[PDB]
Amino acid sequence: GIVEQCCTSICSLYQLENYCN
Amino acid sequence: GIVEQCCTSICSLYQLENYCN
Amino acid sequence: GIVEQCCTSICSLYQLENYCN
Amino acid sequence: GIVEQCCTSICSLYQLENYCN
Amino acid sequence: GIVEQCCTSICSLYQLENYCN
Amino acid sequence: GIVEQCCTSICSLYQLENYCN
Amino acid sequence: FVNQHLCGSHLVEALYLVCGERGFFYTPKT
Amino acid sequence: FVNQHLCGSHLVEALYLVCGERGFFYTPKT
Amino acid sequence: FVNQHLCGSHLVEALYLVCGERGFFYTPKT
Amino acid sequence: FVNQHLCGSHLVEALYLVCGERGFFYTPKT
Amino acid sequence: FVNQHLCGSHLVEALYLVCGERGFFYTPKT
Amino acid sequence: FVNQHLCGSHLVEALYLVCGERGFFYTPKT
């Protein structure tokens, strides 16, 4: 998930938007 | 809610715990 | 400038991008 | 100490209270 | 003290150094 | 540069002053 | 633990510390 | 925009910046 | 992405996130 | 509450949150 | 080095940077 | 003053503290 995606690997700000309400 | 109470007023860490998963 | 606009007013991430290299 | 306890190993918020005045 | 002076007024890094161990 | 100097290796606050405008 | 005055990003940083890998929701008004 | 590694509290501060008003969830367990 | 209220260090942290390894200038008035 | 690794400035921000009014000491040399 | 306006956690983060592994005390009033 | 490793956003927060009014540039590409 978000950790595996944005931390262990890298992630874009657009992917982080996936986790907005 | 909590976001407003912590900022406008004050809140405890025990109150913040209520927003844990 | 941006430093003042973000703090005194509000600004967007798209505006902040203008200060990228 | 605190570094060895809360950084190199993990630590609880209760242990961090050990370092309050 | 320093906590109040930095926040209510302003302080220098040279002043902050006085709270080093 | 600054990354190689202050991150990969260590750096002093005086070196960081090199990057002020 | 003491009472807190927590605005902006500082509120979310406190949630991160309090909740940890249990996770949390951040739900402001409006 | 650009990528990179965001870990611990840096990840939730990034969520805060991105989402802001909307709120977000941080679920490391998924 | 939402609008931001960004003061002090928080402005520079947002620039870091938005610009990344492209880098940025921080140029306040006065 | 939960555990985890707190390093560098993250450790003193955690101390600040925990201790607040009371103050704290940060002594990495011990 | 320039003069600083430092409140809350930001004061402790500045102490961490200035003092480093020499360590520091954080001693607010009351 | 003291040294140590400053990485990611910690490096630009240190620049902010050091430079403040003067502003700074952060250029990881150099």
Ligand SMILES: [Cl-]
């Ligand atoms: Cl603040």
Ligand SMILES: [Cl-]
């Ligand atoms: Cl880190």
Ligand code: NA
């Ligand atoms: Na921070």
Ligand SMILES: [Zn+2]
């Ligand atoms: Zn702040």
Ligand SMILES: [Zn+2]
């Ligand atoms: Zn960090």
